[PDB]
Write a protein that binds this DNA or RNA. Structure first.
Ligand SMILES: [Mg+2]
Ligand SMILES: [Mg+2]
Ligand SMILES: [Mg+2]
Ligand SMILES: [Mg+2]
Ligand SMILES: [Mg+2]
Ligand SMILES: [Mg+2]
Ligand SMILES: [Mg+2]
Ligand SMILES: [Mg+2]
Ligand SMILES: [Mg+2]
Ligand SMILES: [Mg+2]
Ligand SMILES: [Mg+2]
Ligand SMILES: [Mg+2]
Ligand SMILES: [Mg+2]
Ligand SMILES: [Mg+2]
Ligand SMILES: [Mg+2]
Ligand SMILES: [Mg+2]
Ligand SMILES: [Mg+2]
Ligand SMILES: [Mg+2]
Ligand SMILES: [Mg+2]
Ligand SMILES: [Mg+2]
Ligand SMILES: [Mg+2]
Ligand SMILES: [Mg+2]
Ligand SMILES: [Mg+2]
Ligand SMILES: [Mg+2]
Ligand SMILES: [Mg+2]
Ligand SMILES: [Mg+2]
Ligand SMILES: [Mg+2]
Ligand SMILES: [Mg+2]
Ligand SMILES: [Mg+2]
Ligand SMILES: [Mg+2]
Ligand SMILES: [Mg+2]
Ligand SMILES: [Mg+2]
Ligand SMILES: [Mg+2]
Ligand SMILES: [Mg+2]
Ligand SMILES: [Mg+2]
Ligand SMILES: [Mg+2]
Ligand SMILES: [Mg+2]
Ligand SMILES: [Mg+2]
Ligand SMILES: [Mg+2]
Ligand SMILES: [Mg+2]
Ligand SMILES: [Mg+2]
Ligand SMILES: [Mg+2]
Ligand SMILES: [Mg+2]
Ligand SMILES: [Mg+2]
Ligand SMILES: [Mg+2]
Ligand SMILES: [Mg+2]
Ligand SMILES: [Mg+2]
Ligand SMILES: [Mg+2]
Ligand SMILES: [Mg+2]
Ligand SMILES: [Mg+2]
Ligand SMILES: [Mg+2]
Ligand SMILES: [Mg+2]
Ligand SMILES: [Mg+2]
Ligand SMILES: [Mg+2]
Ligand SMILES: [Mg+2]
Ligand SMILES: [Mg+2]
Ligand SMILES: [Mg+2]
Ligand SMILES: [Mg+2]
Ligand SMILES: [Mg+2]
Ligand SMILES: [Mg+2]
Ligand SMILES: [Mg+2]
Ligand SMILES: [Mg+2]
Ligand SMILES: [Mg+2]
Ligand SMILES: [Mg+2]
Ligand SMILES: [Mg+2]
Ligand SMILES: [Mg+2]
Ligand SMILES: [Mg+2]
Ligand SMILES: [Mg+2]
Ligand SMILES: [Mg+2]
Ligand SMILES: [Mg+2]
Ligand SMILES: [Mg+2]
Ligand SMILES: [Mg+2]
Ligand SMILES: [Mg+2]
Ligand SMILES: [Mg+2]
Ligand SMILES: [Mg+2]
Ligand SMILES: [Mg+2]
Ligand SMILES: [Mg+2]
Ligand SMILES: [Mg+2]
Ligand SMILES: [Mg+2]
Ligand SMILES: [Mg+2]
Ligand SMILES: [Mg+2]
Ligand SMILES: [Mg+2]
Ligand SMILES: [Mg+2]
Ligand SMILES: [Mg+2]
Ligand SMILES: [Mg+2]
Ligand SMILES: [Mg+2]
Ligand SMILES: [Mg+2]
Ligand SMILES: [Mg+2]
Ligand SMILES: [Mg+2]
Ligand SMILES: [Mg+2]
Lengths: 63, 96
RNA sequence: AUGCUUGAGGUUCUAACUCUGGUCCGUAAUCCGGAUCGAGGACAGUGUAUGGUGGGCAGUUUGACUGGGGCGGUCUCCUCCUAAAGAGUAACGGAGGAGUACGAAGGUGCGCUCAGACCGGUCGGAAAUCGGUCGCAGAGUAUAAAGGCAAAAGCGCGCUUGACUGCGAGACAGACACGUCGAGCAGGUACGAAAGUAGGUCUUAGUGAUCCGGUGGUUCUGUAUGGAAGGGCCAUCGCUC
RNA sequence: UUGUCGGGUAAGUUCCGACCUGCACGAAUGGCGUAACGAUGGCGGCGCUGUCUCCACCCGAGACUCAGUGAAAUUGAAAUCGCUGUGAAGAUGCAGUGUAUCCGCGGCUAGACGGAAAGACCCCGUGAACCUUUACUGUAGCUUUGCACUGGACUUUGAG
RNA sequence: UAAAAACACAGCACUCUGCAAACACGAAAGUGGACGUAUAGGGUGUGACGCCUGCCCGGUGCCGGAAGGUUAAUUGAUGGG
RNA sequence: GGGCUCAAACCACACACCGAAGCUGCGGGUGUCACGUAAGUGACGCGGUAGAGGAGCGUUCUGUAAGCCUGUGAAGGUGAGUUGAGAAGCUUGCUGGAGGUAUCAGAAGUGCGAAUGCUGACAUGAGUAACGACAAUGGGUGUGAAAAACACCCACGCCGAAAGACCAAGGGUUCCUGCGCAACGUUAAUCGACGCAGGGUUAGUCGGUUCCUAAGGCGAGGCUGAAAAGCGUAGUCGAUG
RNA sequence: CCAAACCGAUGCAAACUCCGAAUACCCAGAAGUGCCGAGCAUGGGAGACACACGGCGGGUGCUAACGUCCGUCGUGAAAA
RNA sequence: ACCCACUCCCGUUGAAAAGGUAGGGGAUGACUUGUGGAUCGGAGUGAAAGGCUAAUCAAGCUCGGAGAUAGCUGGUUCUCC
RNA sequence: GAGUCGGCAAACAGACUUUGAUCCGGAGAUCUCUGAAUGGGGGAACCCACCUAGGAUAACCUAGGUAUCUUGUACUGAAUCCAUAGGUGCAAGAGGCGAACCAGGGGAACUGAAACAUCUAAGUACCCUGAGGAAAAGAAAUCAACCGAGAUUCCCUUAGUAGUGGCGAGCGAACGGGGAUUAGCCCUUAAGCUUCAUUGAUUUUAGCGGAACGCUCUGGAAAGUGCGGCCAUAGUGGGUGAUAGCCCCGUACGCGAAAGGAUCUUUGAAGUGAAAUCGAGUAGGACGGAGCACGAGAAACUUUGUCUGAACAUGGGGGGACCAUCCUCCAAGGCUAAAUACUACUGACUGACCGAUAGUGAACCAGUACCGUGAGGGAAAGGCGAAAAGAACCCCGGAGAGGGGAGUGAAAUAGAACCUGAAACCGUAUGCGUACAAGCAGUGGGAGCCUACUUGUUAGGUGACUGCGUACCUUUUGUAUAAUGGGUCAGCGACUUAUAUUCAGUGGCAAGCUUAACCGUAUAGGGUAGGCGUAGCGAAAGCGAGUCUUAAUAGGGCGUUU
């Protein structure tokens, strides 16, 4: 049968021309103790690291 | 996704965004594709006849990608500033 | 209060219901059913909903390291040594700390320089405050150690909120996720006459991913449409996980 | 701890009697006694004896030989010695050396880490089973009340 | 591979049970208890007999009580959208 | 180890020689680069587990193939020779007696020594242990191919609350007679509960059946239960009586 | 009769340092040699994550162990 | 007699998947025994040993789910570079 | 249309048949006993009855009837007056079996989640019920989205998307589109369906005819060799003594039914659909469940165990909380073909399927033998030859077993345990070696001897003596290891397949490429719905060679020059 994409991976990794976007960790619930610089530089999307692409590419059924 | 029992990357990172249900009926037609339509009038049904958009597509937008070969009329189809200039440069026109 | 809707206890009544009570019949029959008498009686009992109880029974969990295992200890973070003069580097190797604190103990401008000793001096003594000489950091630096500290980074005072918002060239570090430093630009400030300084604290510990839920905003979305709900985005809260 | 004392023996870690310092007895998970009973545990004696000193002789049945029939476990292949070393650390097989003509039969079990059973002890596996409980989460059953089956009346009970 | 000191036992005691008994097997009907009826029946412990069986009710269980607190389904006042 | 002492020990120096799959020589193969638009030359390489990369052999089937080979001898089997770096190929003697398959492609149940692998055959142990109650045999005669075991006779020994005679259960022809001995019989067998054939079992009274019931079963209706069913009344079976 | 400080002589120290190499490491330039390449990037396929001994520097142990734990090199692993 | 199974020896590829010889216990009883019947798989039955339920028992056998799962052990077949 | 009395499996007997047998097909007759088993009983294949009618006089015989339940009907009929319950007769029907498919009731666990409880496995396995050749469903109180579609069922897509999920492992749509089929009828009573006539068509169950070849060589035998022909709407069929278009049976093609079955049809007849008359304990609601992809979630919708409970087209349902507006439909009554599922069974055809350890467990007297109390488990075992021509006769031997001749046959070492006839393993014969010699048994060197021709620079066999040398596999840091595995041989025995997908190689086409289902005198061609690509950025609205962040057109992220 056809391959089933991992639901959790698809909710965290958007495919754009240029890689897979994802948000950052450590921005959820303990933020007063974090500097503004740290919280501002942990904001936005980012491309997936080279070493994690094949693993995530397999979690999604794109390989 | 199995990392040996370590918290997997597909669970360390947060879920984000929502999918757009409103964007499931839309399509983008390049200016290089407008000349492949039949009958000199580019429309919703005429683009489906030319097999340039899917049958379910309900709203179309034209963006500047390629050269408009021939003058055509865009009837009920939106366009970008660059696409609109290119279409009218080739002799085309827009209708509501 | 004559009269009026209806809750909760009690006492009666019989007509539901119950009888593993008598009698008659089906019937050649201790089942059963019907009739009738008697006894209870809206109770009991059963369905459904609900609280309690419940190893009677079931499904399971009950960590790892480890000079075998168990017992004891340890598990994350910081400092020193091991560590072989770049970085890194193990042992149930040798030693200590952390799970905070501070709206001032932050910023700035201005000003100052400790510890200790000796001599003199009311209580006053080894040691309190005062004066003088030496002293030159042996003090201090919220806190463990190490590395720093004269433009003191130590101490005092005035004014303050830069413990700002968006960012960010470029690096260090690094399996990843995280982490560290940061010139400069814009906005808006504070202190200073000004050049300037300020994106916390001399530095290095003081910490916890995701999911889920909560709160404040939001030009996003809104299952016919307009709303709304719900969702997204930004900010933030809840783990001795 | 074979406690100490007494008895029993030539000599008694056992036994019997006692002491009390009961590591850590104790009163229906009964305490302490107790005639009778026991293929019950411990200890002593008489008798009796090949149990033993210490074995001898004898009688049957095997073993042994002949004729007939005819298994077994095991087995990588064998031209399958000792010793001292070496070596995955205890050697028929390696090194050095010694001894040693070839092949049976009766015997014996020192070795072939001899055969037999993928050690049962021990540890491990995010194995199993069954058992326990104030482990967790459930649950049969038992129990509480609401509603239904389920009604009449009279009386103590709030607001309209 | 264990015949025993284990189990049973007569006797003892505690407790439950008023009969459609408790209790047990059964989705239930029914059946056992028992064609019995507290001198009976079940469960529990002890274990002929003799002398006896002491103290503790704090814990847990069981029994009794119900003033107070807390407490389910249910009902739906009120407030906020 | 033998043995060794102006050493065959030790110290110093020197000149020889031995010694490897190292190096060189000679012949061959192969990898990668470069020159070659060629055959080939040049240089440097060529131990190897896990593992990656490359290039092949062979087997069965399909197409090529209504072809080709084949009774003047196919496949298979068993020897010999020969060719290639190898998997392997080719030629041929014998056996065999009717099928085989060139070449190039295409498909795979495609290659075995291990799995205490599975099935069959056959070894080793080994002509070894054993021949199943230590109640016991001896002789004569016969028959027979053959007699310790069969039959008969004369003796001996064993059981005799059985090792004798029965009834039941269970078995099922094993009973008797003729013929027979391959296998079966733990040896032989002429003998047999063995092989082939024939024969043999006679009931009013024995035992069943029939009559009657116990425990218990089933059970019309009936009561109960998701269904399947459970229970049970009237009945109807059910001996061990 | 003991003894602070100071003075002089005199030793020790992984967690002492007024000093302080060799090496090693980082960077730049340069010749030749690389077997035709060493370097880096991207991608396809892994295996491996039980190591052992020897030397050297160490901890630990008794400067015991064919011990144990690191660093570093060599060999075995996988090499006759 | 019958039922049983305390001791020794033998036997242990046994005559025997639990026996035999010699001794041993009960032997009118809570006895032994035949025939028929009832109770069984989280179930029965148990003078209680986790005993027994067809040489099988801390949950029988048989078929099915089923090729359960096996981070474990074993094995994995022609050639060359 | 000439043989026959079935097979193992023949031998003698006795017969039948051109007065048409055997054989094949249709229709009849008979059809013991058991089994739903049905008169009662029962340990299946057995025991015991009764009633009616007839016929025997003895101890019976023939024929029929005698189960239960449901439906209907008739007669009777309690407690209890009428009744009713009950009882008796009659008529019709049912029961049981069968591999799968269908609808429904009940419903696991292992497993996965690298533990495990929610979840998964899965509404699966299994148990049970009912029906039919199909079943079910089915004619919008349905979607959609302001445009419209127009019952049901099935296939391909949409799409592993939306969503769901200890947001873990997993589960997983719909809208829309392309197809296959096409059908709608009624409750003011129909389309249909069933049965019985009836009119014609086929079809099935036996059969008939069916072309055309000779010589020659080898050979046991010709179909093969060589030469020369003929048939073909028949040429790659099976046999026949080796390989056959022309030898036989067949094949293409053309005919054929007394009788039965079946399917289409044309009319007719009743029967049914049939619930009557438009849907009330219904819609809605509360609680607890189940299903919807949806696990309570903000949870619509369906369904119902408990409890309640409307309106009447000026009404009601839905459009995924909910409200308003709009759109769309009319529930609580029914019937309905086709496309779809399956094959225990029958026939034909086919296979880059097997070929006796394979293929069914079973090629053979196989669900047998055997094992088990039983449920159940469950084998092994094919080949003489063309033809039995299966060995007359003689000899040894026990009137044996087995052999030696003879004979048959092409061949007997094809002799019945029979094609071929491998290996392990066991022998006999010959050659060489071997009884002073230590070990993975070989390898390097090497004398002698023997054999054969090539007569010694040869081939083969053996191999004294001597250097070196501790099997293999596995597993390991490391194995001669005294670690593992193998007694040996022969046969079998382990990286497959499907569907999605990525990368590489090699092709087609190229800003395009490609179809799926499906259609298709069918590997063609059509079908371009869909998928991928030609544009990105952003969570998204959106903008777009840009976009996002931001006050910022500044910086920065990603993208754009193929
Ligand atoms: Mg947030
Ligand atoms: Mg299209
Ligand atoms: Mg009640
Ligand atoms: Mg438990
Ligand atoms: Mg489980
Ligand atoms: Mg551990
Ligand atoms: Mg360093
Ligand atoms: Mg260093
Ligand atoms: Mg003073
Ligand atoms: Mg002073
Ligand atoms: Mg400070
Ligand atoms: Mg809306
Ligand atoms: Mg919001
Ligand atoms: Mg004493
Ligand atoms: Mg004493
Ligand atoms: Mg006690
Ligand atoms: Mg007491
Ligand atoms: Mg006692
Ligand atoms: Mg006794
Ligand atoms: Mg002998
Ligand atoms: Mg030794
Ligand atoms: Mg011996
Ligand atoms: Mg052993
Ligand atoms: Mg083991
Ligand atoms: Mg015993
Ligand atoms: Mg007791
Ligand atoms: Mg030399
Ligand atoms: Mg050499
Ligand atoms: Mg060389
Ligand atoms: Mg050369
Ligand atoms: Mg080399
Ligand atoms: Mg190599
Ligand atoms: Mg072949
Ligand atoms: Mg083999
Ligand atoms: Mg192998
Ligand atoms: Mg022997
Ligand atoms: Mg012997
Ligand atoms: Mg013997
Ligand atoms: Mg005998
Ligand atoms: Mg003989
Ligand atoms: Mg007798
Ligand atoms: Mg006889
Ligand atoms: Mg014999
Ligand atoms: Mg006989
Ligand atoms: Mg019954
Ligand atoms: Mg009945
Ligand atoms: Mg009877
Ligand atoms: Mg009797
Ligand atoms: Mg350099
Ligand atoms: Mg590891
Ligand atoms: Mg490691
Ligand atoms: Mg190491
Ligand atoms: Mg070591
Ligand atoms: Mg080690
Ligand atoms: Mg290795
Ligand atoms: Mg006695
Ligand atoms: Mg026990
Ligand atoms: Mg047993
Ligand atoms: Mg179990
Ligand atoms: Mg399964
Ligand atoms: Mg398995
Ligand atoms: Mg009958
Ligand atoms: Mg019957
Ligand atoms: Mg009456
Ligand atoms: Mg039926
Ligand atoms: Mg799991
Ligand atoms: Mg039918
Ligand atoms: Mg139908
Ligand atoms: Mg409309
Ligand atoms: Mg013909
Ligand atoms: Mg032939
Ligand atoms: Mg209606
Ligand atoms: Mg409803
Ligand atoms: Mg509704
Ligand atoms: Mg809506
Ligand atoms: Mg309708
Ligand atoms: Mg077979
Ligand atoms: Mg064969
Ligand atoms: Mg002849
Ligand atoms: Mg043949
Ligand atoms: Mg043969
Ligand atoms: Mg000699
Ligand atoms: Mg020897
Ligand atoms: Mg040689
Ligand atoms: Mg040697
Ligand atoms: Mg080891
Ligand atoms: Mg070695
Ligand atoms: Mg070995
Ligand atoms: Mg050995
Ligand atoms: Mg072995």
């Amino acid at each position: 049968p056809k391959m089933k994409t991992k639901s959790g991976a698809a909710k965290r990794f958007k495919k754009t021309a240029g890689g897979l976007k994802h948000k950052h960790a450590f921005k959820s619930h303990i933020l007063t103790k974090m500097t503004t610089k740290r919280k501002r530089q942990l904001r936005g999307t980012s491309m997936l690291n080279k070493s994690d692409v094949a693993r995530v590419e397999r979690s999604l059924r794109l390989r | 996704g199995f990392e040996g029992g370590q918290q997997p990357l597909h669970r360390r990172l947060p879920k984000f965004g929502f999918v757009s249900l409103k964007a499931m009926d839309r399509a983008e037609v390049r200016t290089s594709e407008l000349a492949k339509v039949e009958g000199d009038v580019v429309s919703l049904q005429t683009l489906k006849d030319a097999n340039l958009i899917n049958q379910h597509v309900q709203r179309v937008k034209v963006m500047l990608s390629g050269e408009v070969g021939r003058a055509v009329t865009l009837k009920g189809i939106a366009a970008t500033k660059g696409a609109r200039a290119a279409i009218e440069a080739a002799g085309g026109k827009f209708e509501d």
